């Protein structure tokens, strides 16, 4: 699949490492642009963006970012009052973007959050917003009565977003399509009469991966767990998986790693 996503977050007051307003854009799960609140400019975060050669591209994104920054300040004040909340560090969130699936079909998303909770969700195929609570209903009615909000978003998600996603996937292809094979280590530690085997895959790219266990060459799902995939500092990824086995049986088990860098899933032993 392919994906373009923009994430926006505002907070009533900053704190260490937390700006008042932020925007980050992702192509196929990798950051490619980010707002700089100090210079008030959208900036590249990956080198292949030099291939975006349209004039005024950065200026246009920067203008949208600055407008949205002002809107987010207004929304925080509006929603504090609508929900009869005390003053404090409240948050507000927007995510939107589009997907191109394996069969070429498309999906589009626009979701709004307030204070860490769902607020509004867009359904482009019915041109309506779903409100999470009675307070969000007030915005639903405002937007559905303006009469052009849903139509403009649906057009963006089905046309503009998809057109730019196809361009970004082509500009970024040598980075996005590279394959890094993980370094895999299987280890074991025993406690309370149980040998826990850990299989750790270090430094794989791209992000999707599947880990399973084989016992004497057979699939074994009993007593298995896995961590969420997490990033390294260089843009590759990391994951762990474990299985509980009988002490003395460690040699019977293999970690099985399904990953695009492995044409055939790799097998690893402790």
């Amino acid at each position: 699949p392919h994906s373009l996503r923009y994430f926006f977050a505002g907070v009533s007051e900053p704190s260490p490492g937390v700006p008042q307003f932020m925007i980050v854009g992702y192509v196929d799960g990798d950051v490619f642009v980010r707002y700089d609140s100090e210079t008030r400019r959208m900036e590249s975060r990956v080198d292949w963006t030099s291939a975006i050669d349209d004039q005024q591209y950065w200026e246009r994104n920067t203008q949208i970012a600055q407008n949205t920054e002002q809107i987010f300040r207004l929304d925080l004040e509006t929603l504090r009052e609508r929900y009869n909340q005390s003053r404090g560090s409240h948050t507000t969130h927007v995510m939107y973007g589009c997907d191109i699936l394996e069969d070429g079909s498309i999906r589009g998303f626009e979701q709004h959050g307030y204070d860490g909770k769902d607020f509004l969700t867009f359904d482009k195929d019915t041109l309506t917003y779903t409100a999470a609570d009675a307070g969000a209903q007030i915005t639903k009615r405002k937007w559905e009565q303006e009469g052009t909000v849903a139509e403009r978003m649906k057009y963006y998600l089905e046309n503009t977003c998809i057109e730019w996603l196809r361009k970004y996937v082509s500009y970024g292809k040598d980075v996005l399509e590279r394959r890094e094979r993980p370094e895999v280590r299987v280890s074991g530690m025993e406690a309370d009469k149980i040998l826990t085997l850990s299989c750790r895959a270090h430094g794989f790219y791209p992000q999707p991966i599947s880990i399973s266990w084989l016992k004497d060459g057979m699939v074994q799902e009993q007593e298995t767990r896995r961590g969420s995939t997490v990033p390294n500092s260089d843009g590759t990824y990391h994951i762990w998986a474990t299985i509980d086995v009988l002490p003395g049986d460690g040699d019977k088990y293999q970690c099985r790693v399904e990953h695009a860098s492995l044409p055939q899933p790799g097998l690893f032993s402790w």
Binding site: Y57, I64, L74, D75, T78, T139, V149, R152, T160
Partner: peptide
């Protein structure tokens, strides 16, 4: 590219 200016809530 980003969507040009969402409405206020």
């Amino acid at each position: 590219i980003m969507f040009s200016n969402k409405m206020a809530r």
